[PDB]
Every structure is written in C-alpha cells, then in structure tokens.
Design a protein around this ligand. Structure first.
Ligand SMILES: C[C@H](CCC(=O)NCCC[N+](C)(C)C[C@H](O)CS(=O)(=O)O)[C@H]1CC[C@H]2[C@@H]3[C@H](O)C[C@@H]4C[C@H](O)CC[C@]4(C)[C@H]3C[C@H](O)[C@]12C
Ligand SMILES: C[C@H](CCC(=O)NCCC[N+](C)(C)C[C@H](O)CS(=O)(=O)O)[C@H]1CC[C@H]2[C@@H]3[C@H](O)C[C@@H]4C[C@H](O)CC[C@]4(C)[C@H]3C[C@H](O)[C@]12C
Ligand SMILES: C[C@H](CCC(=O)NCCC[N+](C)(C)C[C@H](O)CS(=O)(=O)O)[C@H]1CC[C@H]2[C@@H]3[C@H](O)C[C@@H]4C[C@H](O)CC[C@]4(C)[C@H]3C[C@H](O)[C@]12C
Ligand SMILES: C[C@H](CCC(=O)NCCC[N+](C)(C)C[C@H](O)CS(=O)(=O)O)[C@H]1CC[C@H]2[C@@H]3[C@H](O)C[C@@H]4C[C@H](O)CC[C@]4(C)[C@H]3C[C@H](O)[C@]12C
Ligand SMILES: C[C@H](CCC(=O)NCCC[N+](C)(C)C[C@H](O)CS(=O)(=O)O)[C@H]1CC[C@H]2[C@@H]3[C@H](O)C[C@@H]4C[C@H](O)CC[C@]4(C)[C@H]3C[C@H](O)[C@]12C
Ligand SMILES: Nc1ncnc2c1ncn2[C@@H]1O[C@H](CSCC[C@H](N)C(=O)O)[C@@H](O)[C@H]1O
Ligand code: SF4
Ligand code: F3S
Ligand SMILES: [Br-]
Ligand SMILES: [Br-]
Ligand SMILES: [Br-]
Ligand SMILES: [Br-]
Ligand SMILES: [Br-]
Length: 347
C-alpha cells in the first residue's frame, strides 16, 4: 500500500497486522508527519489538552533481577546502591503534593527489603494526602499486589518490555513473558489501573516484533502505555549495542494513541534523554502524561537504568515547576483531577 492508503486505513480503524507493519516500515517524511498529526488530533479529541503530572520517586536502586539492558541489574558492581527510609519517602511525597502533584509514583528495583509491608505502610500514609498512588516495583506474588491494593494503591506500571517470548526470556533471564503477562492480568483483576508498554530498538527485536507489541496492547486494552527507546548502559552486557531510534519510537507512541484513543500515554524520560526536547515532541504526537523526576539528592544520579538521564544534576525540586512551564509553552493545561482513565465506549 502507499502511505496515503495506510493513513486512510488507520483513519477507518482497519488495524490489521499488514497496515501496522507498513506504517512502521515506511520512512517517508510526509507520511510520518501525517501519522503524527493524526495521533495528535485523536489525543486532543479523546483526552483533551490536559497533561497529567505524575511525580516519580525512585526510592531504591537495589535489584535482585539481572535484566540484560538495565544498569540496576544485580551483576553491576560499579553502582553505589541506596535505599530511602520509609519516613524520607513519605515526606518527599508530601513535598510533591505541596508542589501540586496529584499522582505520586513510587518506583524501584526489585528490592526485597520493603516487600510487602513497608510499601503498604508508605502507601497508607501517602493516601491520607488525597492523591493517587501508582506503584512500579516489578514482579511480585499476587498476595503482595493484593495487600498494596488494600493499602490504597490506585495504579501499577509494569511494562511488558517485549511481546516476543523468546527475546523476553533471553533479555530477562530470571523470568518470562508468561510471568510478566500473568502479573499484568493479576493487577487488572485486582482493580488496579494498569500500565504496560515496551522498549523500542532492543538487540534482536524486529519491526514484526514491534507490530506484535502494538497488537498485544490493543488485545489487553491497558489503561496506560509507557514506551521508550532502548538506551545501552556501559556496565551491562548490551553496552556495545545500538541505541533505539527516536523517530521509530515516536511512531510507536503515535500508533498506540491511534489504537487506544482514551489511554494515558507518557512522554517518557528516555525520549528526552536521546533527543533534546524529545518529551515535548512526544506530547505533540499522542502523549498526554509526563513524569517529572522527584527523586531527592543525592540519589538521583544513582538511579541509572540507562546513562545520561536528563535532570540528574539539577536541584531536586526543579522538575515539577519545569514541567508546568513546558505544559504552558506547549499551549496545553495542567491536569485538574487525578487524571484517571476516562473511558469513551465505542464500536
Ligand atoms: C523554515 C526554517 C527556515 C528555512 C530557511 O532558512 N529558509 C527551517 C530552519 C531550520 C528548520 C528545521 C531544522 O532543519 C530541524 C528539523 C529538520 C527536519 O528535517 C524538518 C523539521 C525541522 C524542525 C526543520 C523545520 C524548518 O525547515 C526549519 C525551521
Ligand atoms: C515548527 C516546525 C517548523 C515550521 C516552520 O518553520 N514552517 C515555516 C514557517 C511557517 N509559518 C506559518 C510560521 C509562516 C509561513 C509563511 S513564511 O514561510 O514565513 O513566508 C514544524 C515543521 C513540521 C512540524 C511537525 C510535523 O507537522 C509533525 C508533528 C505534527 C503534530 O500535529 C505536532 C507535532 C509535530 C512534530 C510538528 C511540530 C511543528 O509544527 C513542526 C516541527
Ligand atoms: C510548598 C510552598 C509553601 C506553601 C505550601 O505548603 N503550599 C501547599 C499548596 C498545596 N496545593 C498545591 C495543593 C495548593 C493548590 C492551590 S490551587 O488549587 O493551585 O489554587 C509553596 C509556596 C509557593 C508555591 C509555588 C508557587 O505558587 C508557584 C508555582 C505555582 C504552581 O501552581 C505550582 C508550582 C509552584 C512553584 C508552587 C509550588 C509550591 O506550592 C510552593 C513552593
Ligand atoms: C534535530 C534532531 C537531531 C539532533 C542531533 O543530534 N543532531 C532531530 C532528531 C529527531 C528529529 C525529529 C523526529 O524525526 C520526528 C519529527 C519528524 C518530522 O519530519 C520533523 C519534526 C520531527 C520532530 C524531527 C525534528 C528534528 O529533525 C529532530 C528533533
Ligand atoms: C502557567 C501558570 C499560569 C504559571 C503561574 C505561575 C507560574 C510559575 C511561577 O511564576 C513560578 C515559576 C517561575 C519560573 O520562572 C518558571 C516556572 C514557574 C513554576 C512558573 C511556571 C508557570 O509560568 C506558572 C505555573
Ligand atoms: N537501558 C534502558 N533503556 C531504556 N529503558 C530502560 C532501560 N533499562 C530499563 N528501562 C526501562 O525502565 C523501566 C523501569 S525499571 C524499574 C521498575 C521495575 N524494576 C521493573 O522492571 O518494572 C523498565 O520497564 C524498562 O522498560
Ligand atoms: S528492569 Fe527493573 S527488574 Fe530488571 S534489572 Fe532493571 S530495575 Fe531490576
Ligand atoms: S523536567 Fe527536569 Fe531538566 S529539563 Fe526540566 S529540569
Ligand atoms: Br524543601
Ligand atoms: Br500514573
Ligand atoms: Br517473591
Ligand atoms: Br512510563
Ligand atoms: Br523511561
């Protein structure tokens, strides 16, 4: 098909494997710009001009897993490890709420120390502040997820990473795609607003794999989808592999908006790391959420999933005001409520 014909099929919601493959394979500038415009319009029509701010506290970089792409992998001995205390985490969340955050995101490596009860205690304290709580702690037993839901957690982010089970097992040797999916299904069953998503440009990953990611997201109708480029980290086995392409990753965000028009989709920090102004671009191509870094000094620079992460050298209260300025200069508005998914039922 020509670019014009693929756009017309996307506009009529004929989301076949062939249409998605062709959309990802065409490199024409006119086609790409029209795809980005379509996603931007679908975003405005379905989720409006509000950009929801999720203040993220990366509270521990301790991890038991050995994911091949990740700087926090347990075999990385060249990383200073840290843990915030429960009191530090609560008080830091309180500061974010004082600065206007309406969602607090707690993210960490898979650090057993806190699980499950210290997390439960922390969640209960933050929920007293009248904001949404989102967890991003990795793979744990159903019983842990249940306890956190009972403690008041609202949402859980657990990117599926790659929907190719063979590639998944190789990159994430402690676990499997089956396990990841079982975790996501359990979270949904428990009533969490659930987030999935993937990296783009992983070693071994093909365009067909990317199409399968899109199809997987459509199949499960996730509330949130987090997408970023793979960024090689020098203290990992993938150090010499090629970085993910920004434009290809941007096309994955645009298609995700087109496929899931009422979902919440972040402009991820990885997008801002690989291209200056990458998050702003992404907010104009389908994204409607941003997650300013609220990890306190002196730990920001130690949370090194990937190198060169933006904002790590700044005073640690910088990013909430910064994203508020960003939202304004984009001609957008800040979120007025917790920014939960507002489903638009259709055919
Ligand atoms: C219209 C404006 C003035 C052109 C002139 O001097 N006469 C020129 C000067 C710099 C140009 C941008 C940059 O190249 C970056 C980027 C390259 C992409 O390929 C297409 C988009 C971008 C944003 C460009 C748009 C446009 O083309 C610009 C604004
Ligand atoms: C700012 C930038 C350069 C524009 C430019 O300098 N034009 C030339 C001058 C244009 N005018 C209107 C200011 C004056 C004209 C008359 S004259 O040239 O001065 O004589 C233009 C060129 C291509 C544009 C992007 C694409 O669409 C894709 C995408 C669509 C989404 O929906 C919104 C986001 C995206 C990323 C766009 C953003 C922005 O919009 C871009 C980068
Ligand atoms: C924390 C600190 C001390 C007082 C305090 O504890 N306030 C708690 C405020 C609790 N809020 C955020 C829930 C208020 C809301 C009020 S309103 O709905 O926005 O009217 C107060 C005093 C002045 C406040 C900043 C300024 O205004 C400018 C700016 C306004 C934006 O909108 C949000 C960001 C900015 C940077 C603000 C952050 C924060 O807020 C500051 C630092
Ligand atoms: C200038 C910058 C490279 C910086 C560098 O490192 N040298 C490159 C890297 C990625 C490029 C954007 C993306 O392709 C998407 C989009 C495509 C449209 O067609 C035109 C606009 C967009 C926003 C592009 C503009 C520009 O071309 C970018 C920012
Ligand atoms: C869009 C919104 C209305 C206005 C009202 C008050 C404005 C902020 C404050 O002035 C403090 C601070 C000044 C810095 O210089 C730039 C960032 C800050 C956070 C501003 C951003 C933005 O301009 C705000 C939120
Ligand atoms: N090198 C890298 N490049 C880009 N993104 C990466 C990365 N290493 C990790 N990430 C992303 O960072 C996300 C958060 S990892 C921290 C949360 C939890 N330990 C978990 O694994 O879910 C991952 O889901 C992954 O997509
Ligand atoms: S991606 Fe998550 S689980 Fe895997 S090594 Fe990094 S922090 Fe640990
Ligand atoms: S969001 Fe962090 Fe840097 S670009 Fe803004 S201070
Ligand atoms: Br302070
Ligand atoms: Br969230
Ligand atoms: Br366990
Ligand atoms: Br995300
Ligand atoms: Br990211």
């Amino acid at each position: 098909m020509t670019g014009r014909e693929i756009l017309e099929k996307l506009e009529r919601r004929e989301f076949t494997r062939e249409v998605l493959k062709e959309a990802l394979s065409i490199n024409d500038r006119g086609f790409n710009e029209a795809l980005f415009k379509l996603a931007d319009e679908i975003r405005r029509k379905y989720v409006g001009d509000e950009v929801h701010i999720r203040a993220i506290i990366e509270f521990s970089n301790v991890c038991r897993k050995n994911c091949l792409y990740c700087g926090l992998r347990r075999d990385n001995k060249n990383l200073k490890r840290y843990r915030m205390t429960p009191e530090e985490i609560v008080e830091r969340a309180r500061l974010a709420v004082q600065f206007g955050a309406k969602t607090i995101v707690l993210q960490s490596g898979e650090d057993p120390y806190x699980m499950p009860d210290v997390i439960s205690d922390i969640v209960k304290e933050i929920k007293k502040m009248g904001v949404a709580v989102t967890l991003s702690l990795g793979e744990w037993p159903r019983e842990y997820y249940e306890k956190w839901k009972e403690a008041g957690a609202d949402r859980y982010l657990l990117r599926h990473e790659t929907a190719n089970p063979v590639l998944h097992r190789k990159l994430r040797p402690d676990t499997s795609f089956e396990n990841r999916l079982n975790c996501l299904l359990t979270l949904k069953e428990l009533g969490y607003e659930t987030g999935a998503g993937s990296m783009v440009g992983l070693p071994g990953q093909t365009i067909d794999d990317l199409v399968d990611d899109l199809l997987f997201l459509k199949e499960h109708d996730f509330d949130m989808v987090g997408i970023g480029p793979f960024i090689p980290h020098p203290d990992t086995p993938l150090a010499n592999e090629k970085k993910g392409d920004f434009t290809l990753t941007l096309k994955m965000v645009a298609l995700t908006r087109i496929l899931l028009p009422d979902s919440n989709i972040p402009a991820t920090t990885a997008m801002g790391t690989i291209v200056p102004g990458g998050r702003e671009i992404t907010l104009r191509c389908g994204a409607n959420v941003i997650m300013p870094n609220w990890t306190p000094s002196p730990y920001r620079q130690l949370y090194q999933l990937y190198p060169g992460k933006i904002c790590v050298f700044e005073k640690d209260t910088a990013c909430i005001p910064c994203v508020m300025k960003m939202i304004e200069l984009l001609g957008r508005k800040p979120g007025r409520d917790w920014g939960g998914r507002k489903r638009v039922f259709e055919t």
